[PDB]
């Protein structure tokens, strides 16, 4: 049965057992590439440090 489930994205994430687009995140102080498959939860996020794009970046990549 094809059901169109509505609701908040943090609700659709827990319904679908995935992470969708605007759901809440589980930032837990260690890098998710260190976790094995069984301890990765859908929602395990990571806020990386920034990087300033410069003209030298464009030159070196081109």
């Amino acid at each position: 049965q094809r059901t169109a489930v509505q609701g908040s994205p943090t609700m659709l994430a827990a319904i679908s057992k995935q992470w969708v687009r605007g759901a809440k995140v589980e930032e837990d102080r260690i890098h998710p590439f260190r976790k094995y498959f069984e301890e990765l939860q859908p929602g395990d996020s990571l806020l990386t440090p920034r990087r300033t794009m410069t003209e030298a970046d464009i030159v070196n990549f081109a």
Partner: protein, 63 residues
């Protein structure tokens, strides 16, 4: 160096021998970047923007 991707299968010689690849392999994003280095015209033409990428799969490793 430029991308910042210092993954062990690319920058380590020991762990790449212990990995699934057998030795150090080229980055997949460098295959993707050098490809666009090969097929893109440098001159001004009808092509405007890159707009996205549809469906990428890496099949065999590049050494």
């Amino acid at each position: 160096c430029l991308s910042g991707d210092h993954f062990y299968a690319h920058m380590d010689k020991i762990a790449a021998a212990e990995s699934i690849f057998g030795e150090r392999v080229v980055h997949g994003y460098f295959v993707l970047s050098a490809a666009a280095g090969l097929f893109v015209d440098a001159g001004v033409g009808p092509v405007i923007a890159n707009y996205g990428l549809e469906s990428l799969r890496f099949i065999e490793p590049v050494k």
